[model samples]
Target: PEIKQAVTVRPGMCGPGSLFVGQLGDWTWETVSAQCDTDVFAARDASGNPTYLAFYYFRVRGGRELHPGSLTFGDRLTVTSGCYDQGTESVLTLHRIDRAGSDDAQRPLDLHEFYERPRDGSLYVENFNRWVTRSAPGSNEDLVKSSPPGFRNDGLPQLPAAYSPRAVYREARTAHTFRALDEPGFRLLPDTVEVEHPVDIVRDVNGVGLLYFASYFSMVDKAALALWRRLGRSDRAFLRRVVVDQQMCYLGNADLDSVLTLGARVRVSTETPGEELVDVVISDRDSGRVIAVSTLHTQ
Candidate 1:
């Protein structure tokens, strides 16, 4: 049995607190990524080591918006996170501990993640209490069975019955199709722009030498800037675009010496009007391996 700890996140430059009324007030995937990193950093696994979260998928449940006066610096939020050891990988789930009691207020957002041990080049499994073999990804049953008992019954009552670690892992992977980013049906734009970014060791990697998962968001933002310049768009105009959501699946690793070529393009958004979907593919220039795929949404 592991002891659970909850941490408070104050309104800051990285989240909804940073928004102004006339500005983009909606929560973007970057906001979620920031909060998720904050939450996971404050938690520990059964082995008493900080869980290293790797990005898989992120989704917005329904509708959430933050206006200028809606939140203040005095406002506070808390998060409780738990890590469960599945055989091949670990599952870390986070629930936004909202203090607002209104039913109509956005349903308590559930941010889920899967863990990876980049140092060992294996998945962090809870059952073995170690970095287990990099076996094939497991099924929901295997995941559920490996989750820590403490996490399986955390006191958050708002989570639906299906909102288990296993459930989140399966659904997020299905939505992102972890390794299928280059599948036939996924249409990337004809026009593309590329940028070279070197991995920053000081800010981009975790203690174990695995690149920080949230660092991908910053890379995508950089790619967006390149696309903006390529399109001859003004910085002032591009600033107004709201980031709706983003999906990043980390398929491989990159080190401090790795120079990555980020290929970005704007694709027409088929699901929503007045929105742009940009896909950023990060590939290692040296190894020629696709490191990760990021789908950034903006309006």
Candidate 2:
């Protein structure tokens, strides 16, 4: 049988005395408490910090034997640490244990990871940025035709030389919004030819000077840099990979937003050709905005 329990401390601090549930016989923390016809109610004090007391409790199923009971009877309850750091503060944590099912094969652990949850709402930490994927060009069903005000081309290479002539992503403006200085000349020059009236998705990124763009073709190291340099106006791949999340769901999650962010940067080696060479990269997408670089090498 499998059971579950939680452990936590309170008041954020504990007192001078050592606090812990005494070890039980063969039962271990995974042992199931003996059953009672009546609610075997018990009173316990908030053991943790003296400043704030938190009520703690535990549950045990009735008429269940630790070994013979349904595998569900033995679970870990909450286990906690009550400590008072040099100050008068006090803290205590009640450990809860959950048990596995009656099947002998169900034995996993009395106190394993994710053993229990807190009575109080707490935040969960995880790798959250991997989910950001943006919709590619020709993705929007409700496509709208709108132009920036006073839109005029400054006539710079729109695409980069390293990219294929039929690049997956491209952008142009027939209208105007805000004033742009050298934006007119900015053009996308690809490996084979120059694009005219290229269709792509371009949007403002959090009001930053950078633009967010996404396309279909998977990007390699060389093409990524060529695109970065073209947009940044500097040969250096200084444009960081601000976000690289890819989510097909098209939700508001940040991972999906990376599909369109232009500020992301990449680092390549002189040893290998940019496109052919697999190298280190940093994604600004998740918490480690240093998202992913070449796993084969490290910076």
Clashing pairs in 1: 85-126
Q: Looking at model 2, how many pairs of residues clash?
A: 94
Model 2, runs deviating above 4 Å: 1-217, 220-254, 257-282, 285-288, 295-299
List per-prediction Cα lDDT, in the order shown: 0.44, 0.22
Candidate 2 lDDT over 1-299, as tens digits, reads 22333433332111111111112111221221121111111212233111101111111211112211111222333322111111111111212233322233222322222123321111111110110111333232222222122112232112224322111111101111011213332222332211111122242222111122111112223334554455553543333221111111111212323432222232343453332211223223333332222211111
TM-score quality measure for candidate 1: 0.55
Give the per-residue lDDT digits (tens) of candidate 1, residues 239-298. 656554445555565656778888787765456565666777777877757666666556
Clashes of each: 1, 94
- Using Cα atoms with residue i matched to residue i, what is each candidate's TM-score against the true structure? 0.55, 0.15
